[PDB]
């Protein structure tokens, strides 16, 4: 039983879903992360099976602005009438820069997961990550955080929920290994559109050639990763700096002031002695980096592990191919 | 050890019968002279190789000439080794360690 | 999977180029590769690999030594993504 | 009196246990099996072996370096103390290698070394880093004695690196932690003097805090001062032999400095002309094949008039550190300039760096175990 | 003030954006240039600020030409020029410095592209003379710590200093190296 934790099984994303994702591929939300649709499915053998999606559009002029839910309500009735029902068991934002689970995506997920615990959150990653590995990134939210439910505030319940120490390298389910049983029709088209009408097959396959030759793919990956990751690294370092200074470096001075008092005045207070430690905002363990930021350490290691791999393959192929 | 072979045969006192009394010792040291000649000469002069082996005559040198296949050259040195065969560099050539490095970086 | 069906293409190519050679070997044939596949293959070797000096080979090596140094530096950064993530958790 | 109350009570307790060592290992299966079961640590059983390597060597070095005549210490230990424990059937654990590398240590201080061959052959059991770093310790020293400078310098590099994936933790290098730092530092410093225009591997071995000082030492040694011959040889001696304890320094007993005449003056002969080999190579080999301009430029540099420039020049090419040829008709000196290699550090680091990631990822997942 | 700083800082930042950056200092002409730099809408300069910004952009591009614009025209506007009998002197002082530091800003970028240099070209082009261009390029390769080899009798440089990927690699090498260094403070605080 590969099934998930405490309300749900795995996910299976039927091919006709992913066709409909790559229709709103990476536009209508390029430089803006836009939730491009809800994943509607049903509980199947050892898995969910997302059998259909409908896209959720928004006001994408160059910024994203949430709209009336007149769309979603009418469109989930539109699904219900010819097909099944509104059975939203997840969602997919493709969207912007190879798979990354932002703090906002963790928060939108937290609202989604606590409401319906039959859920995953997809991140459909096409050619942008140099394609590359883990094109379909699933990820559901730890049921620990759905038991120490809201909210991770800056001082209380940052420290306290950091001390509970729920996962932030948390498991991601596999998505496909099996016959989906809607292989059927698209199987029949393969013999037609190979050999005797392999126009559109060969067109798709020869995309590979120009994924290598031209403008700066791995170069631009490593460039964007030279900027994206150093931003995040610097942030933790100056975050950690100030908090560790309130933790120790301020205790150092005020306790050396506690020296001077001699730690007690018998006739009257001890105002000064009392008014040593008066709270700065972090007493320990700023949580939203420790959890949500660390979900993106994992994703940044993934992007690095992805961008590496196709490099490794060339470093075999290049040497070897010329060696003849 | 410092390979002052000229000084070695000068340094010898010939009245110490113990040094005559070790069998094959006089030739053994000569065989070690010629051993290190092969490692670090490409050629050696006929008079030079004689003097290192204790100021040998023309006929005495015929043994040592024949021993490692060495033979005369034009005007007039004794051949010892080919120039590319003596040097044997094993210098700059690596960065071919792809196979192992990709086997460990495989996963 | 795109790698191991890579050399498979070259293997099924080795099958077909045999059959196109073998057409001439038995009796006569190879019109089929006289200047049809003969022009395909000259183009193929003008692409992959490039032309054949040894300056190429050293530049190809220097490019791998760079790519490897960059792929190495990606694992160096994974290691330091770890180390800062770790002391905060301590 | 408190001195030899402690010393004598070590040896008498070891001579006691030596009989138990021989008795348990060989034949009594059930006694070994009974010892496997009861504690939670078999570490207590194994430590006592190579604990008594260095403590016994101390106590016997004292008795050696106090009684210089009518020798009681050295034949008692050599015959009974060492060979009874080691020559017969090993105990079934790492104890077989422990008693081996205890014996290798005992064999090291004695200057009789030629059975380093068969000690490696009887190290059949797998080379755990614990046993392996201490093997390379002595095996490198054996290569240092073999005048295999180029081999031994590599062997000292790895054991000083501190990414041989040591973790210790529970006292298996205790009270001599920095001896492994300073002896590998010191013995590597001697090897650099002999050969180096090759490595270009000294970056890995020794850190820049010490490379800076030891770097200028070699230059100051070979080029312009025999001062470094003194201070190098001062530090080299306690580390070359490893005499664990020098006895109480007083003039009223003699007894101690007499063994140190031999021990020290034995190593005098080592560094003597091996250092003077260095200065010949020190002058960089500027033009690879030297015409009259450069050959005379180098024979002006070797020694002056008259008498015997050419002789001394052709004595020193022989040793190991030149490969060359003389031409008669040309009058030409053609020679060999060989160099090492640039980057060998990166591809050795690619796993080492990943261990900084690994034990990073692992140790915090041991903390993530506890505070969860 | 803004012109004095200009000749100091435009080579400095040319060096910086050739990845010599850790020496980037706020609350300086850097800032005073920055506030004028971030105008989306500047065409011809009609303020003395804008004439400084104008000559600054010319100095970045490394054309002498752009220096002369503000040094002539804005100094007539503006009568920055017309208040000194020594503007005659200070002209020459401004000019040859611009020609030397613009050469330097040019070199801070271009030196990856080079394999060698006709040093004679540089003298002719930036309107300088060989005795000075010797001394300049000599000082430069010593103290800016360049990987050039400099043939001063032949009037040739041979450089071959790589790599364009280095701009990323040294940057993530820094991003890396910054990790351990702040981390030791996080250690030393903790203990």
D335: which strand partners?
Answer: D324
Q: How far apart are CA E129 and CA D313, in angstroms?
A: 51
Q: How far apart are CA D265 and CA D343, in angstroms?
A: 40
Q: Hey, are the CB atoms on D360 and C82 less than 8 Å from each other?
A: yes
Give the number of residues written for chain A: 324
**DSSP code at position D197:** S
Cβ–Cβ < 8 Å for A106, A145 = no
Q: Does D331 touch chain B (CB under 8 A)?
A: no
Per-residue buried b or exposed e for E159-186, using 16+ beta carbons within 10 Å of the residue's own CB? beeeeeeeebbbbbbebbebbeebbeeb
H or E element, residue D190? helix D179-195
Q: How far apart are CA B56 and CA A224, in angstroms?
A: 78
| Tokens found for residue A307 | 């961008």
Q: In Å, how far is E7's CA from the nearest CA of chain A?
A: 30
- Token match 């060495």: residue? B70
Contacting B with CB below 8 Å, chain A residues are 308, 312, 315-316, 319
Give the number of residues written for chain E: 191
Q: Which residues of chain A does E171 touch, with a Cβ-Cβ cutoff of 8 Å?
A: 226, 230
| Tokens found for residue E75 | 């100094």
- Token match 């000084």: residue? B7
Q: Hey, are the CB atoms on C79 and D361 less than 8 Å from each other?
A: no
Q: Which distant-in-sequence residues (6+ apart) come within 8 Å of D241 by Cβ? A: D109, D263, D267
- Token match 């910086």: residue? E16
Cβ–Cβ < 8 Å for A315, C71 = yes
Per-residue buried b or exposed e for A9-20, using 16+ beta carbons within 10 Å of the residue's own CB? bbbbbbeebbeb
Backbone angles phi, psi at D248, to 5 degrees: -45, 125
Q: How far apart are CA D95 and CA A283, in angstroms?
A: 51
The beta strand positions in D256-367, using DSSP E, are 289-290, 324-326, 333-335
Q: Hey, are the CB atoms on A229 and C84 less than 8 Å from each other?
A: no
Backbone angles phi, psi at A211, to 5 degrees: -80, -10
H or E element, residue A97? none
Select from C73, C76, C87 the Cβ nearest to the Cβ of E186: C87
Radius of gyration, CA atoms only, chain B: 21
A55: which strand partners?
Answer: A37
Q: How far apart are CA E19 and CA A230, in angstroms?
A: 15
Q: In Å, how far is D349's CA from the nearest CA of chain C?
A: 9
Q: Which distant-in-sequence residues (6+ apart) come within 8 Å of D25 by Cβ? A: D32, D88, D89, D90, D91, D95
Q: Which distant-in-sequence residues (6+ apart) come within 8 Å of B31 by Cβ? A: B67
Q: How far apart are CA D82 and CA D102, in angstroms?
A: 9
| Tokens found for residue D241 | 């032999």
Q: Is D187 left (phi over 0), alpha (psi -120 to 50) or beta?
A: alpha
Tally of CB atoms within 10 A around D230: 10
Q: Hey, are the CB atoms on E190 and A223 less than 8 Å from each other?
A: no
H or E element, residue E85? none
Q: Which distant-in-sequence residues (6+ apart) come within 8 Å of D301 by Cβ? A: D283
Handedness of CA D355, D360, D365, D370 (dihedral sign): positive
Question: Cα–Cα distances in Å, from D177 out to B41, D55, D150?
Answer: 48, 15, 26
Question: Cα–Cα distances in Å, from B92 out to A40, B96, D334, D336, D342?
Answer: 61, 11, 21, 15, 7
D334: which strand partners?
Answer: D289, D325
Q: How far apart are CA A192 and CA A183, in angstroms?
A: 15
| Tokens found for residue A144 | 């620990």
* H helix runs in chain A, sequence order: 15-21, 70-82, 103-115, 159-164, 184-192, 199-205, 217-244, 250-261, 271-275, 287-288, 294-323
- Token match 């001063």: residue? E152
Contacts by D141-146, CB closer than 8 A, 24 or more apart: D141/D108, D141/D187, D142/D113, D142/D116, D144/D187, D144/D190, D144/D191, D145/D113
Q: Does C78 touch chain B (CB under 8 A)?
A: no
Q: Which distant-in-sequence residues (6+ apart) come within 8 Å of D372 by Cβ? A: A164, A165, A166
Select the residue from C44, C75, C81, C83 to test the A interface by mutation, using most A Cβ atoms within 10 A.
C81
Q: How far apart are CA C22 and CA D279, in angstroms?
A: 70
Q: In Å, how far is B3's CA from the nearest CA of chain D?
A: 5
E8: which strand partners?
Answer: none
Per-residue buried b or exposed e for D337-360, using 16+ beta carbons within 10 Å of the residue's own CB? beeeeeebebbbbbeebbebbeeb
Q: Which distant-in-sequence residues (6+ apart) come within 8 Å of D360 by Cβ? A: C79, C82, C83, C86
| Tokens found for residue D61 | 């070095």
The angle at the Cα of E28, spanning E26 to E31, to the nearest 5 degrees, equals: 70
Q: How far apart are CA D324 and CA D339, in angstroms?
A: 15
| Tokens found for residue E154 | 């032949």
Backbone angles phi, psi at E68, to 5 degrees: -70, -30
Select from B95, B101, B105 the Cβ nearest to the Cβ of C61: B95
Q: How far apart are CA D189 and CA D233, in angstroms?
A: 11
Select from C6, C81, C87 the Cβ nearest to the Cβ of A300: C81
**DSSP code at position A10:** B
- The bridge status of strand A120-124 relative to strand A88-92 is parallel
| Tokens found for residue E167 | 């701009």
- Token match 């320094």: residue? D249
Give the number of residues written for chain B: 107
Backbone angles phi, psi at D197, to 5 degrees: -130, 15
Which subunits have 3 or more CB–CB pairs within 8 Å of chain D?
Answer: A, B, C
Q: How far apart are CA B19 and CA B10, in angstroms?
A: 14
Give the number of residues written for chain C: 90
Cα end-to-end span (Å), chain A:
48
Of A233, D320, E54, D134, the residue nearest C76 (C-alpha): A233
H or E element, residue A137? strand A136-137
- For B6-64, give the DSSP string: HHHHHH--SS-TTTTSSTTHHHHHHHHHHHHHHHH-SEE-HHHHHHHTTS--TTTHHHH
Experimental technique of record: cryo-EM
Handedness of CA D235, D241, D247, D253 (dihedral sign): negative
| Tokens found for residue E121 | 């070209």
Q: How far apart are CA D143 and CA D224, in angstroms?
A: 29
Cβ–Cβ < 8 Å for A40, A86 = yes
Cβ–Cβ < 8 Å for A25, A94 = yes
Cα end-to-end span (Å), chain D:
57
Q: How far apart are CA E75 and CA E73, in angstroms?
A: 5
- Token match 């300049």: residue? E136
Handedness of CA D45, D50, D55, D56 (dihedral sign): positive
Cβ–Cβ < 8 Å for D158, D352 = no
Q: How far apart are CA C67 and CA C45, in angstroms?
A: 24
Q: How far apart are CA A94 and CA A136, in angstroms?
A: 9
Q: How far apart are CA D155 and CA D134, in angstroms?
A: 11
Select from E168, E179, E190 the Cβ nearest to the Cβ of A226: E168
Q: How far apart are CA D26 and CA B90, in angstroms?
A: 50
Select from C69, C70, C87 the Cβ nearest to the Cβ of E183: C87
Of D115, D111, D140, D146, the residue nearest D263 (C-alpha): D111
Q: How far apart are CA C83 and CA E186, in angstroms?
A: 12
Of D121, D1, D8, D130, the residue nearest D60 (C-alpha): D8
The angle at the Cα of A107, spanning A102 to A111, to the nearest 5 degrees, equals: 145
Tally of CB atoms within 10 A around B96: 8
* H helix runs in A24-86, sequence order: 70-82
- By C-alpha distance, the chain C residue nearest D367 is C90
Of A134, A94, A106, A126, the residue nearest A304 (C-alpha): A134
Q: How far apart are CA E114 and CA E164, in angstroms?
A: 12
Per-residue buried b or exposed e for E65-82, using 16+ beta carbons within 10 Å of the residue's own CB? ebbbebbeebbebeebbe
Three-state DSSP state, D116: helix
Bond preceding residue E5 cis, omega within 30 of 0: no
């Amino acid at each position: 039983g590969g099934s998930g934790d405490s309300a749900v099984k795995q996910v299976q994303i039927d091919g006709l879903v992913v066709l409909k994702i790559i229709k709103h591929y990476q536009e209508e939300g390029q430089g803006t992360e836009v939730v491009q649709g809800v994943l509607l499915g049903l509980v199947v053998e050892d898995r969910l099976e997302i059998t259909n999606c409908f896209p959720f559009p928004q006001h994408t002029e160059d910024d994203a602005d949430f709209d009336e839910v007149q769309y979603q309500m009418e469109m989930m009735r539109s699904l219900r009438h010819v097909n099944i029902d509104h059975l939203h068991v997840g969602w997919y934002q493709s969207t912007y820069y190879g798979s990354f689970v932002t703090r906002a995506l963790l928060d939108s997920q937290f609202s989604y997961q606590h409401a319906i615990e039959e859920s995953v959150v997809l991140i459909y990653d096409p050619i942008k990550t140099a394609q590359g590995s883990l094109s379909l990134k699933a990820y559901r939210l730890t049921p620990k955080l759905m038991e120490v439910c809201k909210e991770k505030d800056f001082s209380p319940e940052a420290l306290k929920k950091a001390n509970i120490t729920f996962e932030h390298m948390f498991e991601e389910v596999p998505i496909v290994i099996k016959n989906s049983h809607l292989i059927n029709v698209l199987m029949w088209e393969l013999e037609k559109k190979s050999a005797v009408a392999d126009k559109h097959e060969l067109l798709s396959l020869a995309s590979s050639n120009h994924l290598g030759k031209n403008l700066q793919l791995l170069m631009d990956r490593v460039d964007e990763m030279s900027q994206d990751i150093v931003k995040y690294n610097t942030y933790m370092r100056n975050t950690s700096k100030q908090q560790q200074q309130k933790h120790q470096y301020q205790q150092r001075r005020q306790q050396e002031n506690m020296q001077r008092q001699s730690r007690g005045e018998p006739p009257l207070p001890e105002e000064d002695l009392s008014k040593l430690f008066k709270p700065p905002q972090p007493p320990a363990r700023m949580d939203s980096l420790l959890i949500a930021g660390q979900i993106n350490t994992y994703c940044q290691n993934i992007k690095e592990f992805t961008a590496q791999n196709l490099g490794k393959l060339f470093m075999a192929q290049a040497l070897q191919e010329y060696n003849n | 050890e410092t390979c002052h072979f000229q000084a070695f045969w000068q340094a010898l006192d010939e009245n110490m019968d113990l040094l005559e009394g070790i069998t094959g010792f006089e030739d053994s040291v000569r065989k070690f002279i010629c051993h290190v000649v092969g490692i670090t000469y490409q050629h050696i002069d006929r008079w030079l190789l004689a003097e290192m082996l204790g100021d040998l005559t023309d006929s005495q040198l015929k043994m040592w000439m024949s021993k490692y296949g060495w033979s005369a050259d034009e005007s007039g040195q004794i051949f010892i080794c080919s120039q590319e065969e003596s040097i044997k560099p094993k210098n700059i050539v690596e960065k071919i360690d792809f196979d192992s490095v990709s086997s460990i970086m495989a996963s | 999977d795109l790698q191991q069906v890579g050399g498979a293409s070259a293997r099924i190519q080795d099958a077909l180029s045999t059959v196109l050679q073998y057409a001439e070997d038995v009796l006569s044939g190879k019109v089929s590769a006289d200047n049809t596949v003969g022009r395909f293959l000259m183009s193929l070797v003008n692409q992959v690999p490039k032309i054949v000096p040894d300056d190429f080979e050293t530049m190809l090596n220097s490019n791998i030594n760079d790519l490897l140094m960059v792929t190495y530096l990606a694992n160096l950064t994974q290691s330091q993504i770890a180390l800062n993530e770790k002391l905060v958790n301590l | 009196q408190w001195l030899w109350d402690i010393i004598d009570e070590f040896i008498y307790q070891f001579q006691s246990f030596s009989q138990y060592r021989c008795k348990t290992a060989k034949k009594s299966e059930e006694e070994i099996d009974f010892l496997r079961s009861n504690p939670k640590i078999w570490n207590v059983h194994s430590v006592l072996n190579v604990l008594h390597s260095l403590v016994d060597k101390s106590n016997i070095n004292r008795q050696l370096e106090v009684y210089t005549s009518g020798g009681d210490p050295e034949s008692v230990a050599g015959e009974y103390g060492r060979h009874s424990l080691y020559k017969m059937l090993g105990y079934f654990s790492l104890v077989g290698l422990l008693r081996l590398h205890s014996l290798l240590g005992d064999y090291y201080q004695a200057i009789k070394v030629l059975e380093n061959i068969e000690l490696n052959k009887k190290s059949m059991y797998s080379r755990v880093p614990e046993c392996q770093v201490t093997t390379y310790y002595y095996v490198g020293f054996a290569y240092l004695m073999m005048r295999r400078y180029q081999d031994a310098i590599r062997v000292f590099a790895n054991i000083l690196l501190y990414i041989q994936r040591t973790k210790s933790m529970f006292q298996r290098t205790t009270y001599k932690y920095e001896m492994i730092n300073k002896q590998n530092e010191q013995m590597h410093a001697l090897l650099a003097i002999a050969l180096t225009m090759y490595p270009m591997r000294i970056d890995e071995s020794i850190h820049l805090q010490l490379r800076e000082k030891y770097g200028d030492k070699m230059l100051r040694m070979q080029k312009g001062d025999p001062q470094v011959y003194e201070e190098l040889f001062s530090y080299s001696c306690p580390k070359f032999l490893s005499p664990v304890v020098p006895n109480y320094d007083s003039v009223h007993p003699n007894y101690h400095k007499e063994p140190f005449l031999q021990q020290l003056k034995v190593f005098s002969d080592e560094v003597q002309q091996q250092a003077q080999l260095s200065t010949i190579r020190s002058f960089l080999k500027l033009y690879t094949t030297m015409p009259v301009a450069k050959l005379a430029g180098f024979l002006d540099l070797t020694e002056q008039e008259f008498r015997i420039q050419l002789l001394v020049f052709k004595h020193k090419m022989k040793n190991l550190v030149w490969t060359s040829g003389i031409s008669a008709l040309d009058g030409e000196f053609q020679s060999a300039s060989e160099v090492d290699f640039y980057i060998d550090k990166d591809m050795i680091h690619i796993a080492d760096t990943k261990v900084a990631r690994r034990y990073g990822d692992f140790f915090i997942r041991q903390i993530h175990k506890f505070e969860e | 003030y803004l012109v004095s700083a200009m000749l100091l800082e435009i080579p400095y930042m040319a060096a910086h954006e050739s990845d010599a950056r850790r020496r980037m200092i706020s609350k300086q002409f850097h800032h005073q240039l920055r506030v004028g730099e971030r105008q989306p809408l500047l065409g011809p300069p009609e303020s003395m600020r804008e004439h400084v910004v104008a000559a600054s952009k010319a100095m970045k591009m490394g054309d002498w030409k752009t220096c002369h614009s503000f040094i002539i025209n804005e100094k007539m506007n503006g009568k920055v020029w017309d208040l000194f009998p020594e503007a005659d002197k200070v002209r020459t002082m401004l000019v040859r410095k611009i020609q030397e530091e613009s050469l330097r800003t040019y070199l801070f970028t271009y030196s990856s592209v080079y394999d060698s240099i006709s040093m004679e070209t540089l003298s002719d082009m930036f309107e300088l003379d060989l005795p000075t261009v010797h001394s300049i390029i000599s000082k430069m390769i010593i103290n800016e710590e360049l990987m050039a080899s400099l043939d001063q009798p032949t009037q040739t440089v041979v450089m071959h200093r790589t790599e364009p990927t280095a701009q990323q690699n040294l940057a993530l090498q820094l991003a890396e190296k910054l990790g351990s260094l702040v981390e030791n403070n996080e250690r030393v605080f903790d203990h």
